[PDB]
């Protein structure tokens, strides 16, 4: 069955760096586009980034434009999100999300990881 596991979340001070790692299983990773969706504590779902099947095109949210680097290792079925110069507003949970077809349809979601900045 489809599996999504996120990792790399920890506690860091603002302006620091962090790398998130998401590992997929149960489906051809390189076939679908992946994404990051985040949820701040006590707030609604927030959109972070998507990266295309090949890794050719990366889309970022206006709040993190030029701050985060999204990347993928289709050979290892692994998804990365590099977080640089973190602010305190970035605190929240981060999800791994698959895609069914440049759309907002996500079939399977990851467990999530906690990123805390204080």
């Amino acid at each position: 069955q489809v599996q999504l596991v996120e990792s790399g979340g920890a506690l860091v001070e603002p302006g620091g760096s962090l790398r998130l790692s998401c590992v997929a299983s149960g489906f051809p990773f390189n076939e679908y586009d992946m994404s990051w969706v985040r949820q701040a504590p006590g707030k609604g779902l927030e959109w972070v980034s998507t990266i295309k099947s090949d890794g050719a095109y990366t889309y970022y949210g206006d709040n993190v434009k030029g701050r985060f680097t999204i990347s993928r290792d289709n050979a290892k079925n692994t998804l990365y999100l590099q977080m640089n110069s973190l602010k305190s507003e970035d605190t929240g949970v981060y999800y791994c999300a698959k895609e069914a077809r440049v759309s907002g349809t996500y079939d399977y979601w990851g467990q999530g990881t906690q990123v805390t900045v204080s």
């Binding site: 609604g44 998507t50 206006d62």
Partner: peptide
Amino acid sequence: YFCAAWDDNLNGVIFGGG
């Protein structure tokens, strides 16, 4: 429950308030 759709202005996905 949340609603989401692709927004061309933002060139990204936008979520509802919840």
